[PDB]
Design a protein around this ligand. Sequence first.
Ligand SMILES: Nc1ncnc2c1ncn2[C@@H]1O[C@H](COP(=O)(O)OP(=O)(O)OP(=O)(O)O)[C@@H](O)[C@H]1O
Ligand SMILES: Nc1ncnc2c1ncn2[C@@H]1O[C@H](COP(=O)(O)OP(=O)(O)OP(=O)(O)O)[C@@H](O)[C@H]1O
Ligand SMILES: [Mg+2]
Ligand SMILES: [Mg+2]
Ligand SMILES: [Mg+2]
Ligand SMILES: [Zn+2]
Ligand SMILES: [Zn+2]
Lengths: 541, 534
Amino acid sequence: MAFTNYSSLNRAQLTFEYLHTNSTTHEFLFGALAELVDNARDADATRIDIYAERREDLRGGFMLCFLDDGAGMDPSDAASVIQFGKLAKRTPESTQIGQYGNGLKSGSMRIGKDFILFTKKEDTMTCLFLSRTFHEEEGIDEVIVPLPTWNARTREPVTDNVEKFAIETELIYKYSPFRTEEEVMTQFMKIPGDSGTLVIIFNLKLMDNGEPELDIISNPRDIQMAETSPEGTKPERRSFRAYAAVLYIDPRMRIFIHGHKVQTKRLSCCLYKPRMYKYTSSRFKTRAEQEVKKAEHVARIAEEKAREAESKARTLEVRLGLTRDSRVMLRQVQNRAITLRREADVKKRIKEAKQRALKEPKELNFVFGVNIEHRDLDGMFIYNCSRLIKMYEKVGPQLEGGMACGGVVGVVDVPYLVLEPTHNKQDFADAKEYRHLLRAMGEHLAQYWKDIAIAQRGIIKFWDEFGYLSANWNQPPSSELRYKRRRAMEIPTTIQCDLCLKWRTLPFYPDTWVCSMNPDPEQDRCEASEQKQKVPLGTFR
Amino acid sequence: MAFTNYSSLNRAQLTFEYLHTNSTTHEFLFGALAELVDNARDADATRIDIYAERREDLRGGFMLCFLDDGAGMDPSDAASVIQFGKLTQIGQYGNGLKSGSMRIGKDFILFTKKEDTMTCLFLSRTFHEEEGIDEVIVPLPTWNARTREPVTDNVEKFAIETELIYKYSPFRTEEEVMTQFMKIPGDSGTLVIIFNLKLMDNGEPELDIISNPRDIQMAETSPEGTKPERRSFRAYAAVLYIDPRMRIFIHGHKVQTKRLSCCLYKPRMYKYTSSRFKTRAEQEVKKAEHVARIAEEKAREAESKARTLEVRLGGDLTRDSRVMLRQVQNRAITLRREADVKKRIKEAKQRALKEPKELNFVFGVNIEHRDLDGMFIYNCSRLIKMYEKVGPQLEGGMACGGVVGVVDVPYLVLEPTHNKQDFADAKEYRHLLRAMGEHLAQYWKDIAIAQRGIIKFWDEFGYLSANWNQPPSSELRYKRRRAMEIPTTIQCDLCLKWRTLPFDTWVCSMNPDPEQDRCEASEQKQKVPLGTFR
Ligand SMILES: Nc1ncnc2c1ncn2[C@@H]1O[C@H](COP(=O)(O)OP(=O)(O)OP(=O)(O)O)[C@@H](O)[C@H]1O
Ligand SMILES: Nc1ncnc2c1ncn2[C@@H]1O[C@H](COP(=O)(O)OP(=O)(O)OP(=O)(O)O)[C@@H](O)[C@H]1O
Ligand SMILES: [Mg+2]
Ligand SMILES: [Mg+2]
Ligand SMILES: [Mg+2]
Ligand SMILES: [Zn+2]
Ligand SMILES: [Zn+2]
């Protein structure tokens, strides 16, 4: 639906140095790794393994590997990986984390110089190779990407251009970690199901002392930041095991680091006296109303177009009363009426669906609870379409010098209609609306504090009871048995089944666990339905 | 240096939606505007005008215009604007104009002039949306600056480009477009016009140009720890560069740009030896010396082959022998001049290595506005972080309250994030903040505000109120007590030099100091006294 032909006009293009520019969005390095985790989750993976493969010959001494059992990609899906940005016409997927068409490129190029991706779907498997080493060595200022595909059952090349295929694979054997077709096939065989994806980042960034930024040696079950950790340093900012555990508000996909299961968690299940407050969001309501007004305008224009075409069809029949050209013209009008009518009806259905959703409550659910195990790890955790964006954000009374609201963790999941993330997915694009949300969360936090009445009974004695002997607000509570049990009694023990993925409670560095290991006879089989945490409801003004 | 032919291989491409993705880097809206100001400064502009043009037919009701008298762009410079990624300039990422403009508005049109050309670059998301275009297609017509004839190798392309501009831009005819080019009055300069500005949910633009007609303010209520630089573009623009030269005007009214170190009580400078600075300079040298080493071995082999072939050919001198001898001899000549040029770069890096590898921390007391304190961190002169609390300021206390710190960090030590509002290397940035905090404690000991002591210090400058946030008294005796402590620095509107006065538009000849009394008098540098750490 364009006016002329634009084939001679200038196109904006990506140059090699833009790969670096894009990567500078990630000052928080774990946020780069999170992009690749998000992609596995969006592909409906039930499991992602993040692990190191030692390679003394590559910068940093290892390759960082992300292996998922998700849906994988066919060859055209794989070619769209290097499209920066997505397609505006794409069918809307409101619940996918991926919307910007950029995360894998920004994140991978923060972490290392090069990456190679292997993916399989149905009867194809495709390699995508992004080698900044190649571009530097050969003076390439474009961004050129080998993208060979093989048949997954026979291993024959699938290519319309055998010369292109030869050049692509030769680049891979020259510059990648894998020097032969056999070595490449070995990587494809690490995806053991019918589908999945393996992303390998290599030639990792080094600090000035020549050591990698990512330390996989100090704790061989973890990926840690290679930096000293001061007094108020949050575990999620130094330990990827800790960060990955809270990356999603509703974890289902299982996460393993170096082969060792991460205990993912629902933050609201780890806190003392969790309570939920429903916040009526005027922004949520106004934006839903605008999305409706737009759908109803789009259905309105399509209906007038269908109504005119049907009217013309009828009138043209009367006017024609019946020659050979006239016949053709009559069915071109009659069918055009038919197709506009079905177009108008489909847009009317979308309008109606948005109208139905408009009547649903336009609320954000703020959940608060007291972090009795780690009183200094407090503040708000703000998720956006289930993905963690801000952590440990102080609001309300926590912004004062005081013990008021000290220890309180808040959690909220914000839909895209209310806020969208910044380019690095570590902040919100609409700062004005985000600051509004934080003030609203602060007012509800104050109410939560009144509601649990810690101060009625008295705030210092509350903390004494859980074993905070020390006068320094940041030391952990006592580890002696009486205080451990006092704290543990308040926090249910939850665990995820490795087979069916349901979340279970037990009645008083995890290994394999399945439902039939539970001594509770009501949850002791994978077929037993999942029980929901019933977080009690509080009320505010 | 390409091995085989790569023309059939896939290229990464930019799609229309990427323009939006890229723009989401700017959560701080003024940091999007700063990208365009940075581009004028880098183009050696002596002036930028940022102003609104009312247009009730366009979204937000006005267009935001950036007009500079810098070096402008020839047609190939203009075309490289849409080559994403690029290259003591601020500009290094090849992105800022695109990320910033697309944060502010849906569309932009840029007009630029250099020598005998003038070029229009039109980025219309309206066009792409209306016509379902998923690539990023950019009209780029050029005219001759003197005759106004099109300069184009393809008149059909030129007709389509201009028709797009007349259809989708604010300017519907060639005459209207020429009127914009005529707003660039010198031989060179650039006019960037952002339009169809983003709206808030209430239908109003994010940028408020009404409340103060001499400013561009954020259209949001300001709580009262809210820093002026985060709601007033006039405030932000004044401190955007550590060494302002370019004059900045908003809606025709001059911004009083300033050097923060000149606005503070008892400024002192501490030299901080940076091991990061030294290690990175040493690595940049090791690299240059490897590059010159390889080139020299290549030149030495080629020269040796040239000499040996001369003695081997001896007296022969057939035509065939002569020509092939010169081929070898000239090849030696070229490699030798290549090797010599790399040896010169190596030497230059070696010389720079011996310069001190220091960051200069400057601290002073903000006696006019005690609550506007903390560190201002500049990166190659460009403000990155403001009001960052360090050292004793991170406690509850009056210790180091009111102290502003300033440091300019070279690219070798830190580079900025994608939005130029943070530092890409968080580990080294945190290290820098700790170092600044330690020096801040020393500065506090050094000015000995406890010899006075601290409450009596503040009450002498008129902080009568008990609340730390309220301004000091406005009564005349306290105004003069504060002003007496801050020397007066002022920029000449004609020659752009910075002057100190011994005491709107101002010029050098208005200075009563006989040594700085003429635009031709040499510029005097800040003499900040030096303190020492431990
Ligand atoms: N592990 C994976 N499994 C399946 N598909 C993947 C995987 N990783 C990437 N992709 C595909 O590659 C595309 C590009 O990924 P990328 O992260 O760059 O952008 P995105 O996920 O669409 O958006 P965002 O920028 O918001 O992350 C995805 O849209 C998806 O189609
Ligand atoms: N006002 C201007 N005057 C002259 N040249 C300009 C102007 N604005 C932009 N340019 C040119 O357009 C190019 C692209 O600008 P852009 O801001 O996108 O990237 P950059 O300044 O190279 O790097 P950065 O992304 O760090 O800002 C610049 O390199 C410069 O050559
Ligand atoms: Mg993604
Ligand atoms: Mg699968
Ligand atoms: Mg720029
Ligand atoms: Zn189960
Ligand atoms: Zn002068």
